[PDB]
Structures are given as C-alpha cells and as structure tokens.
Scaffold this motif. Structure first.
Motif, mmCIF file in Angstrom:
data_model
loop_
_atom_site.group_PDB
_atom_site.id
_atom_site.type_symbol
_atom_site.label_atom_id
_atom_site.label_comp_id
_atom_site.label_asym_id
_atom_site.label_seq_id
_atom_site.Cartn_x
_atom_site.Cartn_y
_atom_site.Cartn_z
ATOM 1 N N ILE A 1 -1.029 -2.490 -7.132
ATOM 2 C CA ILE A 1 -1.920 -3.244 -6.273
ATOM 3 C C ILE A 1 -3.161 -2.415 -5.927
ATOM 4 C CG2 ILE A 1 -0.629 -2.642 -4.156
ATOM 5 C CD1 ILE A 1 -2.707 -4.141 -3.034
ATOM 6 N N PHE A 2 -3.032 -1.086 -5.856
ATOM 7 C CA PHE A 2 -4.140 -0.231 -5.456
ATOM 8 C C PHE A 2 -5.119 -0.099 -6.619
ATOM 9 C CE2 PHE A 2 -1.667 2.383 -1.970
ATOM 10 C CZ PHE A 2 -1.508 1.229 -1.218
ATOM 11 N N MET B 1 13.229 8.598 6.415
ATOM 12 C CA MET B 1 12.125 8.584 7.365
ATOM 13 C C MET B 1 11.726 7.130 7.615
ATOM 14 S SD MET B 1 11.921 11.835 7.751
ATOM 15 C CE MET B 1 10.637 11.643 8.989
ATOM 16 N N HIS B 2 11.376 6.778 8.857
ATOM 17 C CA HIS B 2 11.236 5.392 9.259
ATOM 18 C C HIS B 2 9.763 4.985 9.388
ATOM 19 C CE1 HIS B 2 15.262 6.793 10.676
ATOM 20 N NE2 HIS B 2 15.533 5.826 9.842
ATOM 21 N N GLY C 1 10.984 9.288 1.935
ATOM 22 C CA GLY C 1 9.686 9.344 2.595
ATOM 23 C C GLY C 1 9.166 7.953 2.977
ATOM 24 N N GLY C 2 9.554 6.928 2.205
ATOM 25 C CA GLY C 2 9.137 5.557 2.440
ATOM 26 C C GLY C 2 7.906 5.208 1.604
ATOM 27 N N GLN C 3 8.089 4.882 0.332
ATOM 28 C CA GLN C 3 6.973 4.595 -0.546
ATOM 29 C C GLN C 3 7.199 3.238 -1.225
ATOM 30 O OE1 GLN C 3 5.857 7.929 -3.267
ATOM 31 N NE2 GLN C 3 4.062 6.673 -3.832
ATOM 32 N N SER C 4 6.341 2.243 -0.941
ATOM 33 C CA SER C 4 6.459 0.920 -1.542
ATOM 34 C C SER C 4 5.430 0.722 -2.653
ATOM 35 C CB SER C 4 6.335 -0.189 -0.537
ATOM 36 O OG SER C 4 5.089 -0.116 0.132
ATOM 37 N N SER D 1 -0.942 -4.219 6.891
ATOM 38 C CA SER D 1 0.165 -4.265 7.835
ATOM 39 C C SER D 1 0.053 -3.095 8.814
ATOM 40 C CB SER D 1 1.475 -4.281 7.102
ATOM 41 O OG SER D 1 2.566 -4.355 8.004
ATOM 42 N N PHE E 1 -9.637 2.092 2.740
ATOM 43 C CA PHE E 1 -9.607 0.685 3.127
ATOM 44 C C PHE E 1 -8.529 0.495 4.191
ATOM 45 C CE2 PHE E 1 -5.820 -0.085 0.533
ATOM 46 C CZ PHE E 1 -5.951 0.849 -0.465
ATOM 47 N N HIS F 1 -5.570 1.686 11.349
ATOM 48 C CA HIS F 1 -4.639 2.135 10.322
ATOM 49 C C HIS F 1 -5.252 1.835 8.966
ATOM 50 C CE1 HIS F 1 -0.314 1.921 8.420
ATOM 51 N NE2 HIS F 1 -1.101 2.790 7.824
ATOM 52 N N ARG G 1 8.307 13.320 3.832
ATOM 53 C CA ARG G 1 7.098 12.865 4.496
ATOM 54 C C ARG G 1 6.260 14.085 4.908
ATOM 55 N NH1 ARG G 1 7.958 8.277 8.625
ATOM 56 N NH2 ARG G 1 7.932 7.191 6.612
ATOM 57 N N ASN H 1 3.674 9.774 2.120
ATOM 58 C CA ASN H 1 5.091 9.545 1.891
ATOM 59 C C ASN H 1 5.434 9.758 0.427
ATOM 60 O OD1 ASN H 1 5.624 8.790 4.561
ATOM 61 N ND2 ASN H 1 5.407 6.620 4.146
HETATM 62 O O1 LIG Z 1 3.978 2.992 0.304
HETATM 63 C C1 LIG Z 1 3.851 2.884 1.521
HETATM 64 N N1 LIG Z 1 4.696 3.400 2.423
HETATM 65 C C2 LIG Z 1 4.620 3.206 3.870
HETATM 66 C C3 LIG Z 1 5.359 1.991 4.310
HETATM 67 C C4 LIG Z 1 6.751 1.876 3.765
HETATM 68 C C5 LIG Z 1 7.139 1.155 2.680
HETATM 69 N N2 LIG Z 1 8.483 1.303 2.453
HETATM 70 C C6 LIG Z 1 9.016 2.112 3.420
HETATM 71 C C7 LIG Z 1 10.333 2.522 3.629
HETATM 72 C C8 LIG Z 1 10.577 3.355 4.699
HETATM 73 C C9 LIG Z 1 9.548 3.786 5.543
HETATM 74 C C10 LIG Z 1 8.245 3.374 5.341
HETATM 75 C C11 LIG Z 1 7.953 2.511 4.268
HETATM 76 O O2 LIG Z 1 2.864 2.207 2.144
HETATM 77 C C12 LIG Z 1 1.980 1.425 1.296
HETATM 78 C C13 LIG Z 1 0.993 0.756 2.200
HETATM 79 O O3 LIG Z 1 0.140 -0.087 1.395
HETATM 80 C C14 LIG Z 1 -0.235 -1.138 2.282
HETATM 81 N N3 LIG Z 1 -0.791 -2.180 1.438
HETATM 82 C C15 LIG Z 1 -0.139 -2.879 0.441
HETATM 83 N N4 LIG Z 1 -0.917 -3.774 -0.132
HETATM 84 C C16 LIG Z 1 -2.151 -3.637 0.487
HETATM 85 C C17 LIG Z 1 -2.083 -2.640 1.481
HETATM 86 N N5 LIG Z 1 -3.106 -2.263 2.305
HETATM 87 C C18 LIG Z 1 -4.242 -2.886 2.126
HETATM 88 N N6 LIG Z 1 -4.419 -3.843 1.151
HETATM 89 C C19 LIG Z 1 -5.545 -4.583 0.816
HETATM 90 C C20 LIG Z 1 -5.141 -5.433 -0.164
HETATM 91 N N7 LIG Z 1 -3.824 -5.246 -0.524
HETATM 92 C C21 LIG Z 1 -3.395 -4.273 0.305
HETATM 93 C C22 LIG Z 1 1.056 -1.532 2.997
HETATM 94 O O4 LIG Z 1 0.818 -2.393 4.096
HETATM 95 C C23 LIG Z 1 1.615 -0.143 3.306
HETATM 96 O O5 LIG Z 1 1.294 0.342 4.613
#
Ligand SMILES: O=C(NCCc1c[nH]c2ccccc12)OC[C@H]1O[C@@H](n2cnc3c2ncn2ccnc32)[C@H](O)[C@@H]1O
Lengths: 115, 112
Positions: free
Chosen positions: A7-8, B107-108, A93-96, A34, A30, A40, B81, A88
């Motif tokens: 997505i990035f 980590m949360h 660490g929390g990485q989506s 969320s 940017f 943020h 983290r 992360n």
């Molecule tokens: O990878 C991470 N880890 C932190 C959160 C997390 C996920 N899984 C976990 C399990 C545990 C703990 C923390 C986490 O964060 C990726 C970030 O990308 C942000 N994001 C995704 N799509 C768009 C966007 N921001 C602007 N945009 C503009 C257009 N599209 C988008 C999304 O809201 C998030 O904060």
C-alpha cells in the motif's frame, strides 16, 4: 516498481490518496489513517525495504534521514511539547505493512511502557 | 549538561554493555519494560532528537543499524519495537538521545 507492491508503494506512486506532509527524493511523510494520537504520521523511504531487520549497512543514512525528516515535520506541525517515534519489526513489534516506516505521534501525553 | 548516560559512556558507572564502537554504545536498560530492553546511544552529546543536526543523519541511522544487529544477536527473531522519545509529551527521561529496543513479548498498540 519504484516504491514496491505494498500500500505504501501505491501511495509513493500517487495511485492511492494520502495526506502528504513532506516529500523529497528519498522519503515521504503522510498522516496515518488510523491515528493513535492527536497527531500521528509516518515517514517512509521511497526505496522499498521490507522491514528494519533486513536493512543493508548502506541504508544507514536513509534511515537517519527518516528521523531527521520526522523531527522537522513534528516541528512544522507544532509538536512543541514533544513526541514519540516508533519503528516496529515483525510480529512481536507489530507490523501490518512490510515496508519500513517511522511512526511519529504527539499532541498528548505518551505513556510508558510504549506498548 | 552531563547526564547519567554520559557517565555510562565514560565507564564511570556500571552498565551491561552489548556492543561498542567508536561512535555509539548499546547497553541493557536498568528499568526493563520487556524481557529484552536495551538502549543504543551516540557518544556525541545530542540532548534530544529535536536538536539533531542535518550532519547527524548518518549517525542516527547508525544507531538503528546497531540496534537491529544487536536485536538479532540477542535472539529477537519474533520481532521488536524501536522507540525514540522527545520532550515531556514523548516521556523523554534522559536528555541524551537514545534509541530504545524492546522485544521478547508481544508489543501492543497504541505505543503508549
Ligand atoms: O505496520 C504497522 N504497525 C503498527 C500498527 C500495528 C499493526 N499490527 C500490529 C500488531 C500489534 C501492534 C501494533 C500493530 O503500522 C502500519 C501503519 O500504516 C497505516 N496505514 C495503512 N494504510 C494507510 C496508512 N496510513 C496512511 N494511509 C494513507 C493511505 N493508506 C494509508 C496504518 O493505519 C498503520 O498505523
């Protein structure tokens, strides 16, 4: 593709809308869609690096650049009382999104531990 | 504007050192918030990230590279983290720039 498949990558290429704060040849800042604080935002490299654990030695100045751009953007956005920067790695660490990114949060008191 | 981290760099008080080079030091945090919790700091006295100079970018990146190599060496294969705090809202506890690295548990979100 320049910027990768995530997505990035699509944000970098202007294929998906985002609220850009700052852009140069090396990075893009940017707002997060969320937000977990009143302000943020993310700073990301335009070069796709999946996660910090696979960053090359030669990626040092780029990673540093994310933090300098982060602190400059925080300043420009009026985060005078401070902020928190987060990177992360992996599941724990929390990485989506597997594209390296620096979170910058502020406009409220941040607590300890940081998650 | 000396700090406790300055004393640690000068080897004037104890710390569990993980890695050192000519420009940075990594050591375990005295007040750990995860099963593994260490700091990576520059030897140069930068008080806070908000005052880092352009010329410091490479050094700041070095902290992150050192941090990620130390994490791997300490066995943090499920992830971790990295955190830098600025100012009172950031909860910055020592006015010497430091990178926290935490792992060994989930980590949360939010990150404080
Ligand atoms: O990878 C991470 N880890 C932190 C959160 C997390 C996920 N899984 C976990 C399990 C545990 C703990 C923390 C986490 O964060 C990726 C970030 O990308 C942000 N994001 C995704 N799509 C768009 C966007 N921001 C602007 N945009 C503009 C257009 N599209 C988008 C999304 O809201 C998030 O904060």
């Amino acid at each position: 593709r320049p910027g990768g498949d995530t997505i990035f990558g699509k944000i970098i290429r202007k294929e998906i809308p985002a609220k850009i704060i700052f852009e140069d040849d090396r990075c893009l800042a940017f707002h997060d869609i969320s937000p977990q604080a009143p302000t943020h935002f993310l700073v990301i490299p335009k070069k796709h690096i999946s996660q910090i654990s696979v960053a090359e030695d030669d990626d040092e100045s780029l990673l540093g650049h994310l933090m300098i751009v982060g602190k400059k953007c925080a300043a420009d956005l009026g985060l005078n009382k401070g902020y928190r920067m987060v990177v992360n790695e992996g599941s724990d660490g929390g990485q989506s999104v597997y594209h390296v990114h620096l979170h910058v949060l502020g406009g409220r008191q941040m607590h300890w531990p940081p998650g």
